[PDB]
């Protein structure tokens, strides 16, 4: 309302994405979605550079496999860009999270329209959930949708 969040920053070109000093040693997990053939490493740091990898932790106190986990990805609305095919997710769509020790199975429940200042979606609700932040477009700054998914099971990597 009175104060607008600075989370509306434009994600630099794809050149910085493939030329950026990738911090692999900083990766704490990975995300995979066969339905939309999307795969990206999870970056612990919620910096602008980290957001170029397509996935970065929103809250520092997030615990994979427990509570409401959330990641933000930069989408320019151009096929081939990060989080662009995320909006193609359908209800009940399976999503897998890979922690350095295990893998958690999540099921997409749907999508909704929320503002970029809505930190509530990322707040812990005493339940195991996942929240992905995807921007509608680089031209649409009115509102952005957020995809939500619930935990359906857990399976360790043997």
């Amino acid at each position: 309302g009175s104060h607008m969040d600075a989370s509306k920053i434009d994600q630099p070109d794809l050149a910085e994405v493939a030329n950026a000093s990738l911090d692999k040693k900083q990766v704490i997990g990975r995300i995979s979605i066969p339905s939309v053939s999307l795969e990206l490493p999870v970056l612990k740091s919620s910096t602008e550079k980290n957001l170029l990898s397509g996935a970065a932790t929103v809250k520092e106190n997030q615990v994979m496999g427990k509570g409401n986990y959330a990641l933000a990805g930069h989408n320019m609305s151009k096929k081939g860009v990060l989080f662009s095919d995320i909006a193609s997710l359908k209800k009940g769509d399976k999503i897998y999270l890979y922690d350095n020790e295990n893998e958690y199975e999540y099921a997409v429940t749907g999508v909704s329209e929320v503002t970029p200042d809505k930190w509530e979606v990322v707040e812990d609700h005493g339940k195991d959930e996942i929240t992905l932040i995807t921007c509608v477009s680089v031209k649409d700054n009115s509102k952005r949708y957020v995809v939500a998914g619930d935990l359906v099971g857990t399976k360790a990597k043997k």
């Binding site: 919620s46 200042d117 952005r144």
Partner: peptide, 4 residues
């Protein structure tokens, strides 16, 4: 509610 960070970037994106």
């Amino acid at each position: 509610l960070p970037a994106t």
